[PDB]
Ligand binder design. Structure first.
Ligand SMILES: O=C(CCC1CCCC1)N1CCNCC1
Ligand SMILES: O=C(CCC1CCCC1)N1CCNCC1
Length: 330
């Protein structure tokens, strides 16, 4: 089997992307944030505290003839931006882009933190990291990809995110028309539960490539690119007036600037992030100070190849017995 679904940015600056997911019988379609950096499929629901729902579409398990309460199971997840969500668990039929999994754990939120209530366009998350990170207790549950894997034509999914435009998540096949050149594959460590890999270095604009190992995660659920402070300083030094602001929590730059590109290495291959992908717009409405898309990871503990980086590539998440990642230009 295979599946293919379009993923759409929530706003004009790609602050997050959403993909329609069918849950239950008859289907209830929710728009979920596909997150290769976590491993829970959780949704706003009829069980979510009413004051914490503000425009999201909810899953109502009582209206699904295939829903079954997973007795005694609870979940709780805290994310690195200070947000959180928790609740109970159903199993139900879940389909993405024509690919169907029966008995998928659907984690129904009883509580969500403000950043989730405030994101009216995101009805939940669909985790695509390794199932060892799934938070369901006392019986850990498998991700949608883990459940689908054996049925897929090939045990892979691909992320093809667009810059200020829709893109595609495919399951079970590699669309050879969706990229240019060749896909370069690189080793993955699953030891921390992530699609963790080591970039071979970077370049700023037309500058020379610096060969240096940068360990980080491929995280569709992260919007920006988080790299070591040395690398980030070298990038922003090429933008007149750019500075790290203590009030903003990171690098800002004059909105009048033209940003240089940023290149990262995948083995001997190179992925070029155009400068415009690094512009996240005014810090507040009407400001001439703009949010940078490359930020320091120093306070995170790991580097994060988020959407800023991934949207410059066609990315293969190869879930074979020994997982690997593939990157191609497009
Ligand atoms: O990219 C982030 C926060 C990333 C943080 C960096 C380190 C910890 C997490 N998003 C996506 C958009 N919704 C809010 C959360
Ligand atoms: O903060 C995290 C980790 C989430 C934890 C790991 C699994 C359980 C919770 N991020 C940033 C946002 N994208 C996903 C990765």
């Amino acid at each position: 089997s295979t599946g293919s679904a379009t993923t759409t940015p929530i706003d004009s600056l790609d602050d997050a992307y959403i993909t329609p997911v069918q849950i239950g019988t008859p289907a209830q379609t929710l728009n979920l944030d596909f997150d290769t950096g976590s491993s829970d499929l959780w949704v706003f629901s009829s069980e979510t505290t009413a004051s914490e729902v503000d425009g999201q579409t909810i899953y109502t398990p009582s209206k699904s003839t295939t829903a079954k309460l997973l007795s005694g199971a609870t979940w709780s997840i805290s994310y690195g931006d200070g947000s959180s969500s928790s609740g109970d668990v159903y199993t139900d039929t879940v389909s993405v882009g024509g690919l169907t999994v029966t008995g998928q754990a659907v984690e129904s939120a009883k509580k969500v933190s403000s950043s989730f209530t405030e994101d009216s366009t995101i009805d939940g998350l669909l985790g695509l990291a390794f199932s060892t990170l799934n938070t369901v207790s006392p019986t850990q549950q498998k991700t949608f990809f883990d459940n689908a894997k054996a049925s897929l034509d090939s045990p892979v999914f691909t992320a093809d995110l667009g810059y200020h435009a829709p893109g595609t998540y495919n399951f079970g096949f590699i669309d050879t028309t969706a990229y240019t050149g060749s896909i370069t594959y690189t080793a993955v460590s699953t030891k921390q539960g992530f699609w963790e890999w080591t970039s071979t270095g970077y370049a700023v604009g037309s500058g020379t490539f610096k060969s240096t190992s940068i360990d980080g995660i491929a995280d569709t659920g992260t919007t920006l690119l988080y790299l070591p402070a040395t690398v980030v300083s070298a990038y922003w030094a090429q933008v007149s007036g750019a500075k790290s602001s203590s009030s903003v929590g990171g690098y800002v730059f004059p909105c009048s600037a033209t940003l240089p590109s940023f290149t990262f290495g995948v083995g001997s291959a190179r992925i070029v992030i155009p400068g415009d992908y690094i512009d996240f717009g005014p810090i507040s409405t009407g400001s001439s100070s703009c949010f940078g898309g490359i930020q320091s990871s120093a306070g995170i503990g790991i580097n994060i190849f988020g959407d800023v980086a991934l949207k410059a590539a066609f990315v293969v998440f190869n879930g074979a017995t020994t997982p690997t990642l593939g990157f191609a230009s497009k």
